[PDB]
Design a protein around this ligand. Structure first.
Ligand SMILES: [Zn+2]
Ligand SMILES: [Zn+2]
Ligand SMILES: [Zn+2]
Length: 242
């Protein structure tokens, strides 16, 4: 895909008309998604690691495509899912997420920050270590019951939020755009051969939960990390889980 480099840490790829995968490297690359709906709306699935990077994305979208009423959906509680929530909060952008995400952020958020910082103590990681210490951890503001999921419409277009079972973290959910056959899978989907960090993972249910995603009719599937968006990401994920 053509790559728009907003800055040194931020890349944007228009993978389908009006669907943008945002890759923020901080220092690892993590993905979020902006889908423009009509002329007035936009849905943001996940955020970049930081409020400042999230602001850069919001400003770029607004300037390129007209000011949008944004809605965000957090697909987990980690810094790569919601690290930019404060940028949304200060713009009064609704942040949708599950009650499990709220509980996990409250109970595990600071502990996970320390784990993240512990990986950034080496030479060359100084600027990331510093900012990861100070990123404000802000939870969702419009909360649904995890196992119920959530269905809503934005400008007449339906959006579906589905919990398939515990995967990478007990709260991971996927977001499906039926009118576009786009599935944001997030951190439950893997590019390459590894699982990633397993501190919060349920290795007993992860594969069977991802197998449920086979029922979505997909043209594009967004994983949490990595630049690969074909629906075969789902099978790759299944192939690497036990
Ligand atoms: Zn994670
Ligand atoms: Zn704030
Ligand atoms: Zn992740």
């Amino acid at each position: 895909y053509p790559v728009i480099r907003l800055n040194d840490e931020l890349e944007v790829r228009e993978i389908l008309p009006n669907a943008f995968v945002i890759t923020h490297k901080f220092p690892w690359g993590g993905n979020s998604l902006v889908v423009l709906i009509g002329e007035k709306y936009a849905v943001f699935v996940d955020t970049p690691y930081t409020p400042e990077a999230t602001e850069n994305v919001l400003d770029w979208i607004n300037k390129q495509y007209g000011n949008r009423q944004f809605i965000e959906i957090n697909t987990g509680y980690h810094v790569d899912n919601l690290g930019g929530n404060d940028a949304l909060l200060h713009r009064n952008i609704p942040i949708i997420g599950s009650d499990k995400t709220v509980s996990l952020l409250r109970e595990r958020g600071e502990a996970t920050r320390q784990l993240t910082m512990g990986w950034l103590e080496g030479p060359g990681n100084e600027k990331f270590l510093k900012r990861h210490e100070t990123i404000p951890y802000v939870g969702p503001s419009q909360i649904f019951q995890l196992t119920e999921g959530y269905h809503f419409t934005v400008g007449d277009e339906p959006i579906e939020v589905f919990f398939p079972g515990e995967t990478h973290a007990p709260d991971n959910i996927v977001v499906y755009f039926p009118e576009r056959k786009i599935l944001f899978g997030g951190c439950m989907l893997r590019v390459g051969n590894g699982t990633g960090n397993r501190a919060d993972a349920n290795m007993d249910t992860w594969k069977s939960s991802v197998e449920r995603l086979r029922d979505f009719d997909c043209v594009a599937v967004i994983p949490g990390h990595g630049i690969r968006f074909d629906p075969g990401v789902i099978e790759n994920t299944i192939s690497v889980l036990p």
